[PDB]
Motif scaffolding. Sequence first.
Motif, PDB file in Angstrom:
ATOM      1  N   UNK C 180      26.467 -64.202 -24.460  1.00  0.00           N
ATOM      2  CA  UNK C 180      27.545 -64.841 -24.767  1.00  0.00           C
ATOM      3  C   UNK C 180      28.348 -63.503 -25.100  1.00  0.00           C
ATOM      4  N   UNK C 181      29.796 -63.494 -24.357  1.00  0.00           N
ATOM      5  CA  UNK C 181      30.564 -62.385 -24.372  1.00  0.00           C
ATOM      6  C   UNK C 181      31.904 -62.907 -24.905  1.00  0.00           C
ATOM      7  N   UNK C 182      32.574 -61.994 -25.789  1.00  0.00           N
ATOM      8  CA  UNK C 182      33.843 -62.355 -26.395  1.00  0.00           C
ATOM      9  C   UNK C 182      34.527 -61.027 -26.746  1.00  0.00           C
ATOM     10  N   UNK C 183      35.882 -60.853 -26.113  1.00  0.00           N
ATOM     11  CA  UNK C 183      36.688 -59.697 -26.383  1.00  0.00           C
ATOM     12  C   UNK C 183      35.796 -58.346 -25.872  1.00  0.00           C
ATOM     13  N   UNK C 184      35.534 -57.253 -26.568  1.00  0.00           N
ATOM     14  CA  UNK C 184      34.785 -56.152 -26.043  1.00  0.00           C
ATOM     15  C   UNK C 184      33.383 -56.407 -26.531  1.00  0.00           C
ATOM     16  N   UNK C 185      33.048 -57.313 -27.243  1.00  0.00           N
ATOM     17  CA  UNK C 185      31.668 -57.406 -27.596  1.00  0.00           C
ATOM     18  C   UNK C 185      30.879 -58.410 -26.660  1.00  0.00           C
ATOM     19  N   UNK C 186      29.658 -58.284 -26.577  1.00  0.00           N
ATOM     20  CA  UNK C 186      28.731 -58.909 -25.619  1.00  0.00           C
ATOM     21  C   UNK C 186      27.501 -59.055 -26.125  1.00  0.00           C
ATOM     22  N   UNK C 187      27.050 -59.841 -26.965  1.00  0.00           N
ATOM     23  CA  UNK C 187      26.038 -60.157 -27.609  1.00  0.00           C
ATOM     24  C   UNK C 187      25.052 -61.093 -26.906  1.00  0.00           C
ATOM     25  N   UNK C 188      23.614 -61.342 -27.201  1.00  0.00           N
ATOM     26  CA  UNK C 188      22.687 -61.963 -26.480  1.00  0.00           C
ATOM     27  C   UNK C 188      21.939 -62.531 -27.587  1.00  0.00           C
ATOM     28  N   UNK C 189      22.278 -63.973 -27.824  1.00  0.00           N
ATOM     29  CA  UNK C 189      21.172 -64.845 -28.715  1.00  0.00           C
ATOM     30  C   UNK C 189      20.095 -65.215 -28.089  1.00  0.00           C
ATOM     31  N   UNK C 190      18.959 -65.322 -28.805  1.00  0.00           N
ATOM     32  CA  UNK C 190      17.700 -65.697 -28.443  1.00  0.00           C
ATOM     33  C   UNK C 190      17.161 -66.684 -29.538  1.00  0.00           C
ATOM     34  N   UNK C 191      16.171 -67.569 -29.014  1.00  0.00           N
ATOM     35  CA  UNK C 191      15.834 -68.628 -29.905  1.00  0.00           C
ATOM     36  C   UNK C 191      14.502 -67.855 -30.573  1.00  0.00           C
ATOM     37  N   UNK C 192      14.401 -68.176 -31.844  1.00  0.00           N
ATOM     38  CA  UNK C 192      13.309 -67.726 -32.729  1.00  0.00           C
ATOM     39  C   UNK C 192      11.908 -68.719 -32.513  1.00  0.00           C
ATOM     40  N   UNK C 193      11.101 -68.579 -33.779  1.00  0.00           N
ATOM     41  CA  UNK C 193      10.040 -69.460 -33.580  1.00  0.00           C
ATOM     42  C   UNK C 193      10.364 -70.582 -34.680  1.00  0.00           C
ATOM     43  N   UNK C 194      11.858 -70.629 -35.165  1.00  0.00           N
ATOM     44  CA  UNK C 194      12.017 -71.708 -36.225  1.00  0.00           C
ATOM     45  C   UNK C 194      13.009 -72.698 -35.429  1.00  0.00           C
ATOM     46  N   UNK C 203      19.646 -72.776 -40.016  1.00  0.00           N
ATOM     47  CA  UNK C 203      19.960 -71.543 -39.512  1.00  0.00           C
ATOM     48  C   UNK C 203      21.381 -71.134 -39.250  1.00  0.00           C
ATOM     49  N   UNK C 204      21.677 -69.994 -39.989  1.00  0.00           N
ATOM     50  CA  UNK C 204      23.080 -69.438 -39.757  1.00  0.00           C
ATOM     51  C   UNK C 204      23.313 -68.763 -38.405  1.00  0.00           C
ATOM     52  N   UNK C 205      23.247 -67.337 -38.457  1.00  0.00           N
ATOM     53  CA  UNK C 205      23.530 -66.741 -37.240  1.00  0.00           C
ATOM     54  C   UNK C 205      22.055 -66.278 -36.471  1.00  0.00           C
ATOM     55  N   UNK C 206      22.173 -66.035 -35.297  1.00  0.00           N
ATOM     56  CA  UNK C 206      21.023 -65.565 -34.653  1.00  0.00           C
ATOM     57  C   UNK C 206      21.529 -64.607 -33.492  1.00  0.00           C
ATOM     58  N   UNK C 207      20.820 -63.442 -33.577  1.00  0.00           N
ATOM     59  CA  UNK C 207      21.253 -62.418 -32.651  1.00  0.00           C
ATOM     60  C   UNK C 207      20.187 -61.680 -32.263  1.00  0.00           C
ATOM     61  N   UNK C 208      19.565 -61.113 -31.160  1.00  0.00           N
ATOM     62  CA  UNK C 208      18.459 -60.450 -30.617  1.00  0.00           C
ATOM     63  C   UNK C 208      19.321 -58.907 -30.184  1.00  0.00           C
ATOM     64  N   UNK C 209      20.189 -58.935 -29.127  1.00  0.00           N
ATOM     65  CA  UNK C 209      20.544 -57.701 -28.533  1.00  0.00           C
ATOM     66  C   UNK C 209      22.084 -57.743 -28.410  1.00  0.00           C
ATOM     67  N   UNK C 210      22.648 -56.723 -28.020  1.00  0.00           N
ATOM     68  CA  UNK C 210      24.151 -56.579 -27.652  1.00  0.00           C
ATOM     69  C   UNK C 210      24.377 -55.605 -26.575  1.00  0.00           C
ATOM     70  N   UNK C 251      10.086 -59.186 -23.326  1.00  0.00           N
ATOM     71  CA  UNK C 251       9.457 -60.510 -23.450  1.00  0.00           C
ATOM     72  C   UNK C 251       7.801 -60.267 -23.224  1.00  0.00           C
ATOM     73  N   UNK C 252       7.031 -60.124 -24.266  1.00  0.00           N
ATOM     74  CA  UNK C 252       5.639 -60.137 -23.861  1.00  0.00           C
ATOM     75  C   UNK C 252       4.891 -61.171 -24.503  1.00  0.00           C
ATOM     76  N   UNK C 253       3.523 -60.893 -25.084  1.00  0.00           N
ATOM     77  CA  UNK C 253       2.784 -61.832 -25.592  1.00  0.00           C
ATOM     78  C   UNK C 253       3.186 -62.425 -27.053  1.00  0.00           C
ATOM     79  N   UNK C 254       3.538 -63.634 -27.000  1.00  0.00           N
ATOM     80  CA  UNK C 254       4.107 -64.175 -28.362  1.00  0.00           C
ATOM     81  C   UNK C 254       2.877 -64.296 -29.211  1.00  0.00           C
ATOM     82  N   UNK C 255       2.852 -63.554 -30.157  1.00  0.00           N
ATOM     83  CA  UNK C 255       1.771 -63.419 -31.180  1.00  0.00           C
ATOM     84  C   UNK C 255       1.696 -64.737 -32.041  1.00  0.00           C
ATOM     85  N   UNK C 256       0.785 -65.129 -32.946  1.00  0.00           N
ATOM     86  CA  UNK C 256       0.887 -66.143 -33.981  1.00  0.00           C
ATOM     87  C   UNK C 256       1.502 -65.491 -35.196  1.00  0.00           C
ATOM     88  N   UNK C 257       2.921 -65.727 -35.487  1.00  0.00           N
ATOM     89  CA  UNK C 257       3.495 -65.169 -36.678  1.00  0.00           C
ATOM     90  C   UNK C 257       4.172 -63.844 -36.492  1.00  0.00           C
TER      91      UNK C 257
END
Lengths: 632, 316, 316
Positions: C180-194, C203-210, C251-257
Amino acid sequence: KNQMYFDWGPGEMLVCETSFNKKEKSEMVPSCPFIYIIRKDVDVYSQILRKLFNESHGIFLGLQRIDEELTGKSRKSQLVRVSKNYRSVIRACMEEMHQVAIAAKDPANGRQFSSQVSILSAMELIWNLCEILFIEVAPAGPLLLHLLDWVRLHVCEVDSLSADVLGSENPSKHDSFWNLVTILVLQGRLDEARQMLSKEADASPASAGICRIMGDLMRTMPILSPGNTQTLTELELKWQHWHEECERYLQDSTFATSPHLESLLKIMLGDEAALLEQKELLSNWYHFLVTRLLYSNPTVKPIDLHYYAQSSLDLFLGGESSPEPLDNILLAAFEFDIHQVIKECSIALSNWWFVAHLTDLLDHCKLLQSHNLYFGSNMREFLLLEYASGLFAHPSLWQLGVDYFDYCPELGRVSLELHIERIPLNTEQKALKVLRICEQRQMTEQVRSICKILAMKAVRNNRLGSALSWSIRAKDAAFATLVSDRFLRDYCERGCFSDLDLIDNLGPAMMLSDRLTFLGKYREFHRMYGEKRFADAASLLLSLMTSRIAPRSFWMTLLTDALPLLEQKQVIFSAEQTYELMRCLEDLTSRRPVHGESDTEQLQDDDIETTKVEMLRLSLARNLARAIIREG
Amino acid sequence: IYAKFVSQKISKTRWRPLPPGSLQTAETFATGSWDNEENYISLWSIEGDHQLLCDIRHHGDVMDLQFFDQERIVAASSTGCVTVFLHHPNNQTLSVNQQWTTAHYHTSSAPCTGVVCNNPEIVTVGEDGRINLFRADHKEAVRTIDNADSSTLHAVTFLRTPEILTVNSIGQLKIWDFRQQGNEPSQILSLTGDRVPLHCVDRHPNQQHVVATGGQDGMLSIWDVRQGTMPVSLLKAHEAEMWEVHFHPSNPEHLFTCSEDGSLWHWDASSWLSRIEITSLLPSRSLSVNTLDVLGPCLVCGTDAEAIYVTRHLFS
Amino acid sequence: RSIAADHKDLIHDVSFDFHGRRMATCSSDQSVKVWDKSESGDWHCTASWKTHSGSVWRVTWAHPEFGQVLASCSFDRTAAVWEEIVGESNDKLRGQSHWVKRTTLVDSRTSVTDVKFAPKHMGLMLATCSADGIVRIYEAPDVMNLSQWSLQHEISCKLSCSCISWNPSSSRAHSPMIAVGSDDSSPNAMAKVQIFEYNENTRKYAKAETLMTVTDPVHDIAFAPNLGRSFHILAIATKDVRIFTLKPVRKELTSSGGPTKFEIHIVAQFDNHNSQVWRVSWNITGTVLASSGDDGCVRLWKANYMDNWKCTGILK
C-alpha cells in the motif's frame, strides 16, 4: 507533458499492450505489442521452436547433463558417446535454424532474416570452435568443411564484385583482379579462383608452367587426412611441399611478374603465418585466420597468433564488427570465452530460442557447467526458465510453455497455480490439456491439484457424472466416496429412485470409479424390475453397502426400502438373501443405535427406525417358515 | 478387435469425449446411418461387445457427425440441415435442440459436406460453396462466407480460432477467416493438377500449421500453411479414394486413415514434415470404410457392409 | 490500430481480465466500458453503462474462480461490484448487474482511488484505499452468494489524503502480503499468525516492511509475480523521476510459534524518462516490467544476470 499510462497486460493477452492518456481530448486507446524478436506470432517460428525444444530435451534424455567419466577404466566410451550425442544435437539445431531461416526468407522479412542468418552463423562458428575436434581431433576434412560453411554464411563478400572489377576492361593485370583472386582463394573457394583466372590472363613464357602448377594444386587440394595412419599425413604434406617447391622455382627463375604471381604463390604455400602475404591481402580477421590455417598449420593451438595480428588489422576488425552482431561473438568464442556471447545472443539481434539452444548445447558439451553464477543453478537453466516465462500469451498455446518449463526449473508450480486459478469454468479441453502436459514428467502433485480444483469447480454447478470422473481420478478416493454417499442420499426419497435424471449420469475412471457399481445396480433395479432378479440384485447391493463400504447413512434407508417391497406383513421368498438381511439387521442394531428411513405408504405410520428391522425380521421368518420346506 | 452387425450402412463414427481429468479410455461412441430410406443416428456404449443406448431418426444421409460437448452432437444431413442432437446422458434419449435448415441450399437442396466441432461455435460447409459459422443458442449464423468457386467442398479442418481451412474437389486447400472482409481466401495450396479430389482434412494437435489431407487416389499428403503452396510430403498408401483421415490427440506420431478399398492403416512415425511403420487394423473381404475415430487407446470405425469395428486395446 | 473508448471525460485506469479477449475501462464520466477482442485482433465494445455517480478512478477485474466479476471504485464513496450476465445483449447497458456496494463502510467513506482484488488461493477477497487513510479489506464468505460481502479487516496505512496505490502479492506459495502506497510512504502489510484475532476486530495496525528512497508521491505500485524465484519484486512509480524496484527475500519455513523479519533491498533505479511516472505494470511471471512517464514513451525493462534492470526496448 501529458500523463501517459501504459498498462502492460501479460496475464491475459501478452500481445495486446494497451496505452492510454489521462488528459483532455485524448480518449483514444492504442493497443500495441512487445519487441519484434520476443513476440513471434507466426506459426513457422513456433513450430521451429517446438522442434528445437524436442531435439534438445526429448532427444537428449541423459545427454543433456554434463556426465563426467574416467578415461582410464572400462567406461572410456561414455565420453565418446556423450560427445557424439552433443555433436548430433548441435547439427540438428543448426539444421532447424537453417530451415527456419529459409522459411522466414520467403515471408517478406529483412530484419528477421538478417537476425536468423546471424544466429545461424554464430551457431556454425560455435560448432566449428567447439564440437568439431572433441571426440576425434584428427578430423581435418570436417573442420575444414565447417570453417568453409561458416565463412560462406558470415558475409556475402564477394557477390557482385567480379562483374565490377573485371567487366570487359583491358586488362586483368591490375591490383583489383589480384585482390579478388586472393579473397576467393582465402575463403577456400577454389572453383571461383580457377574460373576467374581462366577468363582473361596473359599466358606468357617461363611463368606459364608455374601458373599451371598452381592452378592444378588449387584444383586438386587435399580435404581428407586421418590420424590413424601416417599415409594420409604424408599425402597432405606432399601437396604443401610441392606448392613450396613450385613457389621457389617461380621466384628463382626469369619470372619478372613478382608483384602478383609471387604473392599468390606465397599465399598458397606456407608463407602466410609470418604476416606478409596473408595479412596484407585480407579484408577481415576471420578470413585471414582461415587463410593462414589453410596455408600453414591447420591446428587449433595457433589461433592466438592468427586472430591477433597488428594494430591496423585489430582496428579494422573492430570497425567491421560494429555493424553486425556475429563477428564479435565469433571472435569471443574463438578465444576460449563462449560465456560472453550469451549476452549478445540473448538480445534483439538473435531472438531467444536460438540463444537458449546454444546455451543448452554449451552446458551439455562440458563447456559451461555450474560454478555457480547468480541465478542459483546455471546459465542454460536460467535461459530456459526465462524463455518459458516469456513464451506465454493469449494466441500461443500452453503446451509449448509447459514443455519448455518442464526441462528447466522455474515457472513450474507457480505457473500451474496461476493457470488453475483462472480456469474454474465450463471448459474441459483446457483441463485435459493441462493433465496431459503435467503427466509428461515426474510431477504427480500438480495434476492431482488441477483435478481436485476442476472437481471443486464442477461441483458448484450441480453437474452429476462430469464431476464424479474428476473427483474419482487423480483425487484419491475420499471425494469419490463423498459423491457416492451424496448420490445415495439423494436417490433415497420416494418409491421411484430417480435423482440423477435428464442428462447427468457418468462414471468411468479405473478401479477408483468402477468399484462404485452399487449405485448403478440400485438404479438399474429401481428403473427395471425383472421378476426376482432385480430384487436379488438390490438385496445384494444393500448387503454390500451395509458391510462398511458405501458409508452407513443411506444404508439403513436402502434396507428399509428393500424390506418394504418383499413383505410388509405376510410371507415372501428370498434365495440366499434372508440370512444376509438378518445378519445386517442384527449388526446395525448392535452398533450405536443409529439409522433412519424415508416416508411413503407403510413407512409413514411408524415413528422410530427399528420398525423396519422388525418388519424385515418378521418377513424373513415367515418366508423361512412357509417357503423353506419346499423339498424335492 | 471385434466387429458388430447392425444392418445399417454406417457413414460416420465419432467417440464420445471424456470429462475433465479422466483416467480410463472412451466407452461410448456415436454412429450415423446413411444410404437408406430411414437413417438413424444411434449411440453405442461398451471378446468385446457393445449395446445400443439411444436411437433417433435423422432425415437424409448423415454425411458428417461430430460431438461438440459431452451431451451435444452435431450432424450434417444430405439436405442441408445442420441439426444439433442433444443426447441425454441419464435418460438415454437423443433429442433435437437446435437445427438450421438453411445452412446449405441452392438458389434445390445442397448437401452439407464437413462439420467442425469447437466450443462454442459451429463451422460447417456444403456443396454450394457456403462456409457458415453458427454458434450455440443462435437462430442465424454469425458469419457466412459465400465462395464463388466452381468446385465443391468435401471437408473442413480448423487450425486456429477462428480461421478454418477447407478442401475443394480440385485438390486445393483454401484458408479463410470468420472475421475477414469479403468472400476470398487468404491462402491457397493445391497439388499438381485439378484431377485429384480431396475428401478428408485434419490438422495436428500440437502444430497449428501442419495438416494432413487425402485425395481421391489414396496418397496421404501432408502440407503446411507456411511452406509455399504445395505439399511437403506425398506418400501413397491405398489404391482407392481416401475416406477419412485423422491423427491421435494424445500422441502426434500415430495417425490413422480410412480409404474406399477396405483397409484401415495406422501409420506410426514414432515427424510428418521430414521410416514410417504402417499396420492395417482390418483385412480384406469387408467392403469400404466410411470414418474412423481414435481416442487414445480406443478405436472405433464403420464399414459399408453393416459392420462396426471396435478395439479398446490398440497399444496393449 | 488505435480505437476510441467512447468516453466523454478522460480515462483513468484500464485493466484486463485473465483470458485474453476482455478489457475493462473506467473514465471520469461515470461509465464502465468493457472491451472484447475478436479473432482478427480487433477490439470491440461489449458493454458500457453507468456504475456510480462520481468519477471512476480504480477498476479491476476478479479471477475466474467465482465467475466474471469486476470491481470499480469512484470518488462518490462507493465500491460496487458488477457481475457479467450471459443472458443479455451486447451494448445494451444491461449485461453488468450490480451485486453489492461498499458505501456504508467506515474505512471506505472517502474518495477511493485504489481497488485491486486478491488472489484466488485465499478466496474472493479485495482491498480498497480511500482518502481517509484506512485500507478496507472486504471478503465474501459464501462463494454462491455474490452479495454477501463482509468487512474482514480495517487497517490504517496513512492519515492524510494523497495518491493511494494498492498492490497484492500474486505468489501462491508465500504468505498473504499486500503493498500500500500513500504520499511519499510505501509500506507493505503482511498477515500474521493471528487470523482469528484479526477477523474478530482486535488487531489494530499491521506492518512488515516499508519501501523508502522516495522524495515524491507514488503514482503507481505493482508487485511482480515470483514465478520460480524465492524472493519478491515490487516496482514503484514515484513523481521524482525515479523508477525504484524493491527486492524482499524473507519468506522461509514458518515455525510453530516463531516469527520473521521482512528485509528490503533496492535493486535498481531507472531515470531515462526524466519525467513523472504514471503507470508501472509487470509481467505474468515476473520477467518484464514497464514504466510510462510524462515524456510519451514506454520503456520495457527486463531482468539481467545479477538482478539488474536493463531497458530492452522503448516504444513511443
